[PDB]
């Protein structure tokens, strides 16, 4: 059975548990015996969870960031329902209280010992929230519908949870032998080695002696560094770049000159050097896996004897407020002159403490790590800029965590995507954040579900898949059940790749309608129909995906002709009809990000009071260019609608008025004027956000409607400016906005105000948008490389002004738009 796991994992990872053997690796050793220790032990803890505190961790809250409404509720195992008349400030244990007076009434005779489902979904009610505070309830409240709830029994619950249990000495300089290399080019070759701790150099940069592009070079030179052995910090990073000459990149590697049992290293090491785009300290510390076509280094480390970083107790041992809010040399000067009384009096400006300590100076790095260690906590916004690859020392990376260890379950979610790629600066395999991660992962399911899918969606890329697949074998052995749910979602995805392979294939030799036809066929076979139904969606793992709707399954015309899945689930009613898109062949990180980053507005906007009706629908890359898209029923996009179709409700006699002729007949009489403010409210929103964002090619094709009257934007290839965007005021918008009339500055300018409120609320946040940028730079998104892409999020926020300045600004800029709509 031990044997049925660890293939089922191997299967679930994308990668054989054979191949970290075969590595024969002491530090992938540790790693797999440690971590598997850790995730256990939390397994243990989990089995047994309290009825309501497994609730928790399996199905966790959905809270947002008087009034009377009717709700049906029904009991586990029967078909009888009750409709109720609550109000919305009642709490979930009001309303059980009711369906059991219900129950008892009918049945002829405690709400502590239930908690409510929500229909169809795997998502609950409990808490002392008032019901309004719970995301479903919202959506029912706003959307119009009734909420549909099952009262679930503790002893059901726990059924559940049944089912699913598993040294200062050395002052002489540092130096190497180059020893050879065995590469290919056309002209000299040199090696330029620098050594690094993060950005910043510990000394200048050395180079090789020219010599043919040879061989097969051979070097056998000292290359001399200027710094001493006893200044080398613990975090001490030997980057090499390897090109040529009569300026022509070949390949790059890097190492850590401490392994991960903190020993200095020696001797000889072989390099397998990466392809390049000269130094590239942000590079991974691990050799190219394809060791058959890598271009090899042989270095020789030499034995400057066994010697390790001391420890921490050894360490341990040994106009000011003007600036401090890029700074000259006296004035970092007085920055570290004055180290104690920014401990004491300015606890919050650590980072630009750190930024000027002389990381190449031991006694400096010692008092500056004395400062460190009683150093009060920092709140979580300071903690993620640390993560950043600035601060790659350890104990500040601890600290960072420590400080992190404050998130929320919801606002580590809304981080998650930025803390995974930070894994990626990481120089060792075992490290805070993973354990961290999994730590906090296996506490809570929809954080577990997340960080495998983050995970698994890169393991087709070479840097990453041990760390990785390391981390994803971990988390399955804390949680066996879940693996194998997981298992199921890969298997769907599976499956939906190869249709989408035929359906490629057969969309070029013949109809639409006659592949579609194909496909269903295809559908309906056994192994499909199995393979594709009755799964936790990858989404969303609270939606279920029940029965697939073949005859409703179709794609979409696009060069990857992308997949379009619908579902329905009896018990769910009309919010178990659920669609899905596949698309494989393009790249959904960018789509995601984006995402990511309007659903973070909006909980800001939120949590300011204003709720500019956005459509954060689900987007989640899954594997090597693929991934899915959530969709967002009773939608159709700016350009369909104006189409200006005849024999149809929205018949035009000006194009101006397709799309308000079209908001009218999906909102007849009095429910017009809500669905214009909706449309409104959702217009201010986007025009913002694609404004902060930098998001330009917009036009009808990738802008949605509702038939609430939201307006949402999909199919985001650009961002950052990434073809400086401008502000954007679209006429047919700016139409609906006015009620259909040609001048109305009092809607107008109610939609101005909204526009200038989210952008204010924005401004004051601006900090938390720049650190999770800074930390998304570790993605390789190629419109997310360097410091102008973040300067582009400066300029469009106006960070460096006070709120009058930004605000006149942006209204040059809305203004100027205004002009620009005809
Ligand atoms: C004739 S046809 O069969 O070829 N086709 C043409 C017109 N289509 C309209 C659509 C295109 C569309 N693209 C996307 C997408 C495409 C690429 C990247 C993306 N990122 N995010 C979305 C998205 N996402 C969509 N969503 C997302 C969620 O909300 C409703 C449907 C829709 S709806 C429907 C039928």
Same mark, same amino acid.
């Given at each position: 059975?031990?044997?049925?796991?660890?293939?089922?994992?191997?299967?679930?990872?994308?990668? &054989?548990?054979?191949?970290?053997?075969?590595?024969?690796?002491?530090?992938?050793?540790?790693?797999?015996?440690?971590?598997?220790? +850790?995730?256990?032990?939390?397994?243990?803890?989990?089995?047994?969870?309290?009825?309501?505190?497994?609730?928790?961790?399996?199905?966790?809250?959905?809270?947002?960031?008087? @009034?009377?409404?009717?709700?049906?509720?029904?009991?586990?195992?029967?078909?009888?329902?009750?409709?109720?008349?609550?109000?919305?400030?009642?709490?979930?244990?009001?309303?059980? $209280?009711?369906?059991?007076?219900?129950?008892?009434?009918?049945?002829?005779?405690?709400?502590?010992?239930?908690?409510?489902?929500?229909? &169809?979904?795997?998502?609950?009610?409990?808490? =002392?929230?008032?019901?309004?505070?719970?995301?479903?309830?919202?959506?029912?409240?706003?959307?119009?519908?009734?909420?549909?709830?099952?009262?679930?029994?503790?002893?059901?619950?726990? $059924?559940?949870?049944?089912?699913?249990?598993?040294?200062?000495?050395?002052?002489?300089?540092?130096?190497?032998?180059?020893?050879?290399?065995? #590469?290919? =080019?056309?002209?000299?070759?040199?090696?330029?080695?620098?050594?690094?701790?993060?950005?910043?150099?510990?000394?200048?940069?050395?180079?090789?002696?020219?010599?043919? *592009?040879?061989?097969?070079?051979?070097?056998?030179?000292?290359?001399?560094?200027?710094?001493?052995?006893?200044?080398?910090?613990?975090?001490?990073?030997?980057?090499?770049?390897?090109?040529?000459?009569?300026?022509?990149?070949? !390949?790059?590697?890097?190492?850590?000159?401490?392994?991960?049992?903190?020993?200095?290293?020696?001797?000889?090491?072989?390099?397998?050097?990466?392809?390049?785009?000269?130094?590239?300290?942000?590079?991974?510390?691990?050799?190219?896996?394809?060791?058959?076509?890598?271009?090899?280094? *042989?270095?020789?480390?030499?034995?400057?004897?066994?010697?390790?970083?001391?420890?921490?107790?050894?360490?341990?041992?040994?106009?000011?407020?003007?600036?401090?809010?890029?700074?000259?040399?006296?004035?970092?000067?007085?920055?570290?002159?004055?180290?104690?009384?920014?401990?004491?009096?300015?606890?919050?400006?650590?980072?630009?403490?750190?930024?000027?300590?002389?990381?190449?100076?031991?006694?400096?790095?010692?008092?500056?790590?004395?400062?460190?260690?009683?150093?009060?906590?920092?709140?979580?916004?300071?903690?993620?800029?640390?993560?950043?690859?600035?601060?790659?020392?350890?104990?500040?990376?601890? +600290?960072?965590?420590?400080?992190?260890?404050?998130?929320?379950?919801?606002?580590?979610?809304?981080?998650?995507?930025?803390?995974?790629?930070?894994?990626?600066?990481?120089?060792?395999?075992?490290?805070?954040?993973?354990?961290?991660?999994?730590?906090?992962?296996? !506490?809570?399911?929809?954080?577990?579900?997340?960080?495998?899918?983050?995970? @698994?969606?890169?393991?087709?890329?070479?840097?990453?898949?041990?760390?990785?697949?390391?981390?994803?074998?971990?988390?399955?052995?804390?949680?066996?059940?879940?693996?194998?749910?997981?298992? #199921?979602?890969?298997?769907?995805?599976?499956?939906?790749?190869?249709?989408?392979?035929?359906?490629?294939?057969?969309?070029?030799?013949?109809? %639409?309608?006659?592949?579609?036809?194909?496909?269903?066929?295809?559908?309906?076979?056994?192994?499909?129909?199995?393979?594709?139904?009755?799964?936790?969606?990858?989404?969303?793992?609270?939606?279920?995906?029940?029965?697939?709707?073949?005859?409703?399954?179709?794609?979409?015309?696009?060069?990857?002709?992308?997949?379009?899945?619908?579902?329905?689930?009896?018990?769910?009613?009309?919010?178990?009809?659920? &669609?899905?898109? +596949?698309?494989?062949?393009?790249?959904?990180?960018?789509?995601?990000?984006?995402?990511?980053?309007?659903?973070?507005?909006?909980?800001?906007?939120?949590?300011?009071?204003?709720?500019?009706?956005?459509?954060?629908?689900?987007?989640?890359?899954?594997?090597?260019?693929?991934?899915?898209?959530?969709?967002?029923?009773?939608?159709?996009?700016?350009?369909?609608?104006?189409?200006?179709?005849?024999?149809?409700?929205?018949?035009?006699?000006?194009?101006?008025?397709?799309?308000? /002729?079209?908001?009218?007949? %999906?909102?007849?009489?009095?429910?017009?004027?809500?669905?214009?403010?909706?449309?409104?409210?959702?217009?201010?929103?986007?025009?913002?956000?694609?404004?902060?964002?930098?998001?330009?090619?917009?036009?009808?094709? /990738?802008?949605?409607?509702?038939?609430?009257?939201?307006?949402?934007?999909?199919?985001?290839?650009?961002?950052?400016?990434?073809?400086?965007?401008?502000?954007?005021?679209?006429?047919?918008?700016?139409?609906?906005?006015?009620?259909?009339?040609? =001048?109305?500055?009092?809607?107008?300018?109610?939609?101005?105000?909204?526009?200038?409120?989210?952008?204010?609320?924005?401004?004051?946040?601006?900090?938390?948008?720049?650190?999770?940028?800074?930390?998304?730079?570790?993605?390789?998104?190629?419109?997310?490389?360097?410091?102008?892409?973040?300067?582009?999020?400066?300029?469009?926020?106006?960070?460096?002004?006070?709120?009058?300045?930004?605000? %006149?600004?942006?209204?040059?800029?809305?203004?100027?738009?205004?002009?620009?709509?005809?």
């Amino acid at each position: 059975v031990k044997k049925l796991i660890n293939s089922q994992i191997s299967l679930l990872i994308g990668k &054989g548990l054979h191949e970290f053997d075969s590595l024969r690796d002491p530090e992938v050793n540790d790693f797999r015996t440690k971590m598997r220790q +850790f995730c256990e032990e939390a397994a243990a803890h989990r089995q047994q969870l309290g009825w309501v505190e497994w609730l928790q961790y399996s199905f966790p809250l959905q809270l947002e960031p008087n @009034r009377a409404l009717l709700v049906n509720v029904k009991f586990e195992g029967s078909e009888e329902s009750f409709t109720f008349q609550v109000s919305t400030k009642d709490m979930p244990l009001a309303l059980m $209280a009711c369906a059991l007076r219900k129950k008892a009434t009918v049945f002829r005779q405690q709400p502590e010992e239930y908690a409510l489902q929500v229909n &169809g979904r795997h998502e609950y009610l409990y808490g =002392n929230y008032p019901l309004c505070h719970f995301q479903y309830i919202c959506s029912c409240l706003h959307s119009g519908l009734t909420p549909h709830l099952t009262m679930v029994h503790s002893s059901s619950i726990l $059924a559940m949870r049944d089912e699913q249990s598993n040294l200062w000495s050395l002052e002489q300089p540092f130096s190497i032998e180059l020893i050879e290399g065995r #590469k290919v =080019n056309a002209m000299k070759l040199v090696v330029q080695a620098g050594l690094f701790h993060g950005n910043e150099m510990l000394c200048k940069t050395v180079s090789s002696s020219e010599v043919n *592009v040879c061989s097969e070079p051979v070097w056998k030179q000292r290359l001399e560094f200027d710094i001493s052995v006893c200044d080398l910090p613990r975090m001490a990073r030997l980057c090499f770049a390897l090109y040529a000459v009569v300026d022509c990149p070949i !390949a790059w590697a890097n190492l850590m000159l401490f392994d991960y049992k903190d020993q200095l290293k020696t001797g000889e090491r072989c390099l397998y050097m990466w392809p390049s785009v000269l130094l590239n300290p942000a590079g991974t510390v691990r050799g190219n896996p394809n060791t058959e076509s890598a271009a090899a280094l *042989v270095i020789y480390l030499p034995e400057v004897a066994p010697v390790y970083f001391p420890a921490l107790e050894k360490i341990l041992e040994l106009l000011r407020e003007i600036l401090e809010r890029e700074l000259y040399e006296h004035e970092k000067d007085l920055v570290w002159k004055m180290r104690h009384e920014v401990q004491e009096h300015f606890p919050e400006a650590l980072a630009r403490l750190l930024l000027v300590t002389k990381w190449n100076k031991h006694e400096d790095v010692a008092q500056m790590l004395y400062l460190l260690c009683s150093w009060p906590e920092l709140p979580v916004l300071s903690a993620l800029e640390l993560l950043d690859f600035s601060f790659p020392d350890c104990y500040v990376g601890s +600290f960072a965590i420590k400080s992190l260890r404050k998130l929320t379950d919801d606002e580590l979610f809304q981080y998650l995507l930025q803390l995974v790629q930070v894994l990626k600066y990481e120089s060792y395999l075992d490290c805070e954040l993973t354990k961290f991660l999994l730590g906090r992962a296996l !506490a809570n399911r929809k954080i577990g579900h997340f960080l495998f899918w983050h995970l @698994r969606s890169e393991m087709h890329v070479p840097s990453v898949a041990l760390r990785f697949g390391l981390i994803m074998e971990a988390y399955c052995r804390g949680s066996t059940h879940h693996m194998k749910v997981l298992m #199921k979602q890969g298997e769907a995805l599976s499956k939906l790749k190869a249709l989408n392979d035929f359906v490629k294939v057969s969309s070029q030799k013949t109809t %639409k309608p006659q592949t579609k036809e194909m496909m269903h066929m295809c559908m309906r076979q056994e192994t499909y129909m199995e393979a594709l139904s009755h799964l936790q969606s990858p989404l969303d793992p609270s939606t279920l995906l029940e029965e697939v709707c073949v005859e409703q399954c179709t794609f979409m015309d696009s060069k990857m002709k992308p997949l379009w899945i619908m579902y329905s689930s009896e018990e769910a009613g009309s919010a178990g009809n659920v &669609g899905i898109i +596949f698309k494989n062949g393009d790249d959904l990180r960018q789509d995601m990000l984006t995402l990511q980053m309007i659903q973070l507005m909006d909980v800001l906007w939120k949590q300011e009071g204003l709720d500019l009706r956005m459509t954060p629908y689900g987007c989640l890359p899954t594997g090597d260019r693929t991934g899915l898209i959530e969709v967002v029923l009773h939608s159709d996009t700016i350009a369909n609608i104006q189409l200006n179709k005849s024999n149809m409700a929205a018949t035009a006699a000006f194009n101006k008025d397709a799309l308000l /002729n079209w908001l009218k007949s %999906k909102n007849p009489g009095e429910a017009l004027d809500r669905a214009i403010e909706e449309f409104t409210l959702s217009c201010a929103g986007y025009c913002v956000a694609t404004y902060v964002l930098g998001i330009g090619d917009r036009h009808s094709d /990738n802008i949605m409607i509702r038939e609430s009257g939201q307006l949402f934007h999909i199919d985001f290839g650009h961002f950052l400016g990434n073809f400086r965007v401008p502000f954007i005021l679209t006429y047919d918008f700016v139409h609906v906005i006015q009620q259909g009339k040609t =001048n109305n500055s009092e809607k107008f300018e109610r939609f101005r105000g909204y526009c200038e409120r989210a952008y204010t609320i924005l401004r004051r946040h601006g900090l938390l948008f720049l650190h999770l940028f800074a930390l998304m730079r570790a993605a390789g998104l190629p419109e997310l490389s360097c410091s102008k892409d973040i300067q582009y999020l400066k300029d469009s926020l106006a960070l460096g002004k006070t709120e009058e300045e930004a605000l %006149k600004h942006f209204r040059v800029k809305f203004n100027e738009a205004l002009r620009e709509s005809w």
